[PDB]
Amino acid sequence: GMMKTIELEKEEIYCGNLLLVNKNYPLRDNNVKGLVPADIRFPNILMKRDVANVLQLIFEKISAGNSIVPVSGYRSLEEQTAIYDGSLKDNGEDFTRKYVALPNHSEHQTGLAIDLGLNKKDIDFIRPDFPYDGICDEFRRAAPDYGFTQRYARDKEEITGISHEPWHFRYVGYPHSKIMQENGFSLEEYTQFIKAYLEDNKYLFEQAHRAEIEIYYVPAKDDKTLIKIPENCVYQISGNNIDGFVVTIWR
Ligand SMILES: C[C@H](N)P(=O)(O)C[C@H](C)C(=O)O
Numbered sequence: 001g002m003m004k005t006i007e008l009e010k011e012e013i014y015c016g017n018l019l020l021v022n023k024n025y026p027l028r029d030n031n032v033k034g035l036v037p038a039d040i041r042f043p044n045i046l047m048k049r050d051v052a053n054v055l056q057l058i059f060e061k062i063s064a065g066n067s068i069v070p071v072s073g074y075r076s077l078e079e080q081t082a083i084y085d086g087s088l089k090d091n092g093e094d095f096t097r098k099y100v101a102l103p104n105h106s107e108h109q110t111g112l113a114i115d116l117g118l119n120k121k122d123i124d125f126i127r128p129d130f131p132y133d134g135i136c137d138e139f140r141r142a143a144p145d146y147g148f149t150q151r152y153a154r155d156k157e158e159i160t161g162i163s164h165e166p167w168h169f170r171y172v173g174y175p176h177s178k179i180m181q182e183n184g185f186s187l188e189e190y191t192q193f194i195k196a197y198l199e200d201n202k203y204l205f206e207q208a209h210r211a212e213i214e215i216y217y218v219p220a221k222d223d224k225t226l227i228k229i230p231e232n233c234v235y236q237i238s239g240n241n242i243d244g245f246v247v248t249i250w251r
């Protein structure tokens with residue numbers, strides 16, 4: 001069918017669901033919009049609208065009720081700075097470096113990350129309880145089917161630069177979250193992995209009776225990057241926050 005051309009400015013590599021934000025790769029566009037409260041019960045915890053909707057779907061699916069509470073969603077630069085500096089004072093430098101992202105290097109500043117905890121009257125804000133049992137683990141096991149990944153695993157500390165965090169989940173979107181789950185990938189690993197699949201050798205994601213999904217990487221040019229898409233598809237494009245774009249085509 002008719003193919004259409006998408007023309008992207010280089011700065012668009014710093015927007016999208018698949019941004020890799022870490023010590024190496026800072027947030028460069030602060031202008032997150034479409035933030036909404038994640039839940040009526042927690043008006044001060046904001047997330048990107050589509051992400052809040054997905055969270056509700058997961059809570060519905062596992063019948064979480066009130067057993068899981070959102071502890072921290074979107075954080076502004078001033079909030080992240082206060083948390084970091086406060087942790088320096090309370091917890092010391094070593095702990096802070098391991099458990100708090102540098103300001104402008106936190107996924108919380110994107111609206112795509114959420115810290116979750118067991119519903120108990122006293123919850124540690126910095127390290128909330130989200131065990132590998134019961135309802136919390138039901139969430140954790142369902143998450144990749146809906147677009148979420150547990151961001152900071154114990155076995156990936158050396159490449160994420162952050163200690164094991166049971167509670168911190170990152171939205172990357174389906175099917176990326178599932179591909180990461182299947183391969184045991186951190187987001188760092190997935191960001192490298194997908195660069196092996198260019199437009200002329202796309203990655204194929206398929207299961208049962210739903211449509212096939214193709215995924216590929218497009219390196220950013222210094223100026224305008226040109227991408228072609230079928231008019232005959234639902235598609236997504238994201239920057240990777242580093243050097244290019246990831247394109248997702250629903251067949
Ligand atoms: C501050 C909490 N421990 P976190 O938000 O789960 C840490 C994370 C690396 C960040 O500061 O973005």
Ligand SMILES: [Zn+2]
Nearest residue numbers: 113114115168
């Ligand atoms: Zn977090």
